[PDB]
Amino acid sequence: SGFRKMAFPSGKVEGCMVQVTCGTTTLNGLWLDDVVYCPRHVICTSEDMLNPNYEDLLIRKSNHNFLVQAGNVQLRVIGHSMQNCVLKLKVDTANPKTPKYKFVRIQPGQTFSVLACYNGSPSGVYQCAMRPNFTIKGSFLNGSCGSVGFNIDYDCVSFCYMHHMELPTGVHAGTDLEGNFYGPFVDRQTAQAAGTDTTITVNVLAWLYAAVINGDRWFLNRFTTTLNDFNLVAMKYNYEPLTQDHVDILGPLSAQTGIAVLDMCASLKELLQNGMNGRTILGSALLEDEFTPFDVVRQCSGVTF
Amino acid sequence: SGFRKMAFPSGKVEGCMVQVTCGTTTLNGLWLDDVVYCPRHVICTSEDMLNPNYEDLLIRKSNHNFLVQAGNVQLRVIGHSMQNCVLKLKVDTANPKTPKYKFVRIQPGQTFSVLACYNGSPSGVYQCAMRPNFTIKGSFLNGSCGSVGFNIDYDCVSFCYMHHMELPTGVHAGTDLEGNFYGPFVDRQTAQAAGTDTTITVNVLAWLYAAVINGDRWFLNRFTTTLNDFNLVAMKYNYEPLTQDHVDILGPLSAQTGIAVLDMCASLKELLQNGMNGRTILGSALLEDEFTPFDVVRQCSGVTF
Ligand SMILES: COC1(CS(=O)(=O)N2C[C@@H](C(=O)Nc3cncc4ccccc34)c3cc(Cl)ccc3C2=O)CC1
Ligand SMILES: COC1(CS(=O)(=O)N2C[C@@H](C(=O)Nc3cncc4ccccc34)c3cc(Cl)ccc3C2=O)CC1
Ligand SMILES: [Cl-]
Numbered sequence: 001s002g003f004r005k006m007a008f009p010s011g012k013v014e015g016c017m018v019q020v021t022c023g024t025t026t027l028n029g030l031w032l033d034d035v036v037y038c039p040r041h042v043i044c045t046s047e048d049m050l051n052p053n054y055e056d057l058l059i060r061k062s063n064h065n066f067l068v069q070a071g072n073v074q075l076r077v078i079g080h081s082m083q084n085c086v087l088k089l090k091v092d093t094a095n096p097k098t099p100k101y102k103f104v105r106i107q108p109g110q111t112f113s114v115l116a117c118y119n120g121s122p123s124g125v126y127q128c129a130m131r132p133n134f135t136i137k138g139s140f141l142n143g144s145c146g147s148v149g150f151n152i153d154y155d156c157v158s159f160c161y162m163h164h165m166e167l168p169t170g171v172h173a174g175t176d177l178e179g180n181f182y183g184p185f186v187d188r189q190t191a192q193a194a195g196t197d198t199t200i201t202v203n204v205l206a207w208l209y210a211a212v213i214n215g216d217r218w219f220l221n222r223f224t225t226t227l228n229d230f231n232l233v234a235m236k237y238n239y240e241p242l243t244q245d246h247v248d249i250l251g252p253l254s255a256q257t258g259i260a261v262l263d264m265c266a267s268l269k270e271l272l273q274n275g276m277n278g279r280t281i282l283g284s285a286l287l288e289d290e291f292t293p294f295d296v297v298r299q300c301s302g303v304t305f
Numbered sequence: 306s307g308f309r310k311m312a313f314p315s316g317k318v319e320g321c322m323v324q325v326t327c328g329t330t331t332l333n334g335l336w337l338d339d340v341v342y343c344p345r346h347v348i349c350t351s352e353d354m355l356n357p358n359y360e361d362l363l364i365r366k367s368n369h370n371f372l373v374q375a376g377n378v379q380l381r382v383i384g385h386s387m388q389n390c391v392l393k394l395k396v397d398t399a400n401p402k403t404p405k406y407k408f409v410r411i412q413p414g415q416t417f418s419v420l421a422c423y424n425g426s427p428s429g430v431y432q433c434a435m436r437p438n439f440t441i442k443g444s445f446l447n448g449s450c451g452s453v454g455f456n457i458d459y460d461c462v463s464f465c466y467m468h469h470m471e472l473p474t475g476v477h478a479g480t481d482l483e484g485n486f487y488g489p490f491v492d493r494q495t496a497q498a499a500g501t502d503t504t505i506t507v508n509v510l511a512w513l514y515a516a517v518i519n520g521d522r523w524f525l526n527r528f529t530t531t532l533n534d535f536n537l538v539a540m541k542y543n544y545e546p547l548t549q550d551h552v553d554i555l556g557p558l559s560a561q562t563g564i565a566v567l568d569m570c571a572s573l574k575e576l577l578q579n580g581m582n583g584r585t586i587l588g589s590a591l592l593e594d595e596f597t598p599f600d601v602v603r604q605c606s607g608v609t610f
Contacts, residue, residue, distance in 0.1 A: 001475035002444035009420060009427040011316030115314065121609030124311035125430055137588070139307035141607045170306035170519070214475070283442065285590035299429070301446055 003210055003282045005290065006299060007113035007127040008152040015097030018075065019120030020089070020146065021067040028117045028146025029068065029089070030159065030177070032098050036068050036075070036089040037177060038146045039164050040082055041187050049189035058082055069120060070095075084179030085187050086162065100156040103177035108132045109200040109240070111292050112149040112160050116140060129203070129290040132240050133195040134183025135171040136161070149174075167194050199239045200289040202246035205264055207288045209253035210296045211281050215305035218279060220259065223266040230265040237272045249293050257304055308515050308587050310595065311604055312418035312432040313457045320402030323380065324425030325394070325451065326372040333422040333451025334373065334394070335464065335482070337403050341373050341380070341394040342482060343451045344469050345387055346492050354494035363387055374425060375400075389484025390492050391467065408482040409456075409463040413437045414505040414545070416597050417454040417465050421445060434508070434595040437545050438500040439488025440476040441466070454479075457610045472499050504544045505594040507551035510569050512593045514558035515601045516586045523584060525564065528571035535570040542577045554598050 020029040020038045024045070029038040041049070043057045061080065066089055068075040079090030106112065111129040115122050116139065128136050128149075140147065140163060149161030164174045164187055171194050173185040185192055208219065225233075231241045242265065250261045259267075268287075276285055291299075325334040325343045329350065334343040346354065348362045366385065371394055373380040384395030411417065416434040420427050421444065433441050433454075445452065445468060454466030469479045469492055476499050478490040490497055513524070536546050547570070555566045573592075581590060596604075 001471055002442060002477070004431040004433070004442075004444035005310060006421070006429040006431045006444060007312060009315045009319050009430050011314075011319040011427075014314050014316040116311070116607075118607045118609050122314040122316075123607055123609040124309075124604065125314055126309040126311045128309070137307060139309040139311060139604060141605075143607065166306060172307070280591070286585070286588075299444060 001214060001301075001305075003214060003299065005127045006295075007125045008150065010113065010115045010122065010125045012099040012152060012157050013115045013148060013150055014122045015099070016095060017115070017117050017120050017122055019069040021069070022061070022065060026119065027143065028120055030146070030148055030162070031068075031070060031075075031091070031095045032101060034091050034094045036077075036091055037162065038087050038089070039162065039175075039187065040085050040087040040179070041145070041164065042087060051188060051190070054082060058087075082179075085164065085175050085181060086177070086179030102156055102158045104151075104158045104160050105176040105178070105180065106130050106160045106182075108134060109203055109292065110160075111290055111295055112151050114138060114149045114161070114163075115147060116144055117147045118143045127290065129200065129292075130161075130182060131171070131197050132200060133197045134185070135167060135173055135194045135197070138163070138172040140166060140172055148177075167192060169194055196238075199237070199287070201234060201239045201242045201268075202249065203289040203292055204239075204268060204287045205242075205246075205250055205261070206253065206293040206296045207282070207291045208264055208267065209250070209257055209259070209293075210291065210300050212257040212259060213253075213296075213300045213304050214282065216281060219271055219281065220263075220267050221270050223270070224260070224263050225266045225269060227262065227265075230262070230269060233269050234272065239272075253293060253296060256302070306519060308519055308604065310432045311600075312430045313455065314610055315418065315420045315427065315430045317404040317457070317462050318420045318453060318455055319427045320404070321400060322420070322422050322425050322427055324374040326374075327366070327370060331424065332448065333425055335451070335453055335467070336373075336375060336380075336396070336400045337406060339396050339399045341382075341396055342467065343392050343394070344467065344480075344492065345390050345392040345484070346450070346469070347392060351494070357493055359387060363392075387484075390469065390480050390486060391482065391484030405461040407458075407461055407463045409465050410481040410483070410485065411435055411465045413439060414508060414597065415465075416508075416595055416600055417456050419443060419454045419466070419468075420452060421449055422452045423448045432595065434505065434597075435466075435487060436476075437503045437505065439490075440472065440478055440499045440502070443468070443477040445471060445477055453482075460610065472497060474499055501543070504542070504592065506539055506544045506547045506573075507554065508594040508597055509544075509573060509592045510547075510551075510555055510566065511558065511598040511601045512587070512596045513569055513572060514555070514562055514564070514598075515596065515605065517562045517564065518558075518601075518605050519587065521586055524572045524576060524586065526572055526575060528575075529565060529568050530571045530574060531567065535567065535574060538574045538577060544577075558598060558601060
């Protein structure tokens, strides 16, 4: 029993964190095999940030202009290249702590663990989700650039996010490990704003199933709904549309609890209308959307209470 | 910006997790130097658990009855002894991954990171607090016994909790690393209940300071109060008493935000008597009490390990 916002154990990722310095700028890098990956804005001065010409700035750099530090050991840079918004520094030593890994680009609604780092040193681990507006609600300060997001399903680490910037609303933007930004963002200090955010409906449904598995049913009702009537209602509460894909994905949780997806959809509709009336669901007074169907299956028991 | 329930990086602890098997029972162990620490109930069958005489059960065991597995390597048990509710298995190999460590007994209200393990393999990391009723609200399934709680102080891991059991309410009970239970619990299959819980007042105040640092000030008011007046209010809402020690500990957060601790108490008093009125604080509709004053400072300043 219990249901917590659970992050993956960070040890496999901690062994890859390094500190990258280019002139006056210092940030974090990810050292896998003989390559160190970091945000390309490490080559920028504060006077460059508005409209940087990265190719022009990079062509003026040599290998020895990049200082890479792993613990208290200096790594020797023997090559450098740019792939989209990520800089790849070839080093003379393969990381002995390199775990089995993959680079994956995730979709909105997907969750991951973030290992927040400063000066190549991990300071904390937390779980978060890729918001529908392609931002993440992280906890990041100046110097956290280069911190990564990952999932560790089985023994392989799937890297899905590298931190690049904070937007004026306090939310964060970054790229996949191939340097492609999530969302309509750019690595420039120009005016950029996150689009209107929405609640991840399939994730709220998954979390309602997690509550049934753990013994709670106060929110269920005798009603059902069509998929379209649910979306007509939920979108009036800024909820993302629920697709047939989402309904199919919730199939196993539906079979485990005995509650059809569209019946859980009717329960959600009622919750949005009534609020909780002083009650909580899994220790929360809000509807939680940062647990996917896959997270619920991984954390909860296979036997309903 | 941002504020997350953040756990310490788990890597130093992951390198210590092993699987302990005694007959039919399998659980987790903590391997530090040449000793493996695990719950002493590993020697119990389902019949023994009803009324166990642990010394009598232990005297029957030999070193070879205990199977200890570190990754895919079998460790050789060369001795065994009991300290309170923890079993100590002496092994022929010192753990090469043993970090700098201490065993500390924490007090209610203090927080720690939990590395949830199954079969000696870490599956997740989450942050939680020692509740005033000495239980923890964890996320644990069968096989999680032996999972540990810890904090990191500079480069030293302070082990403070080892998981033993789940109570009927779904909350958890365990011991320090010297086998002393937190709370009025015993290690046996018998009816036990968590006492009435209370809210950790100094922690709610710390979290209100965190919200102010993050630009959430709607709950601030022009009022102040006294320790006597506020403690009457706290007693009424099942809040733990606030002492002069708590006020002193909140001193730095008070100086950083410009809000005197009893100024923040008058905000908390108004929140208790009147609610949030449809508003949230740091994305929560409840008053959060699982962040200590030190956690707020550490996360708002980026301390690394
Ligand atoms: C909105 O103003 C901020 C960010 S900034 O310092 O002005 N800044 C510097 C930098 C940036 O965001 N860095 C940071 C990353 N993560 C969390 C940060 C929390 C505080 C300070 C900086 C942080 C950046 C990088 C790129 Cl690729 C593009 C733009 C910027 C940029 O705008 C103060 C929040
Ligand atoms: C309250 O009923 C439960 C627990 S139990 O299975 O009946 N049980 C087994 C065991 C125990 O708690 N184990 C578990 C620990 N953590 C999470 C667990 C989730 C499910 C099952 C077991 C879990 C235990 C150990 C000690 Cl030292 C003393 C007593 C017990 C005990 O009572 C069904 C939840
Ligand atoms: Cl995805």
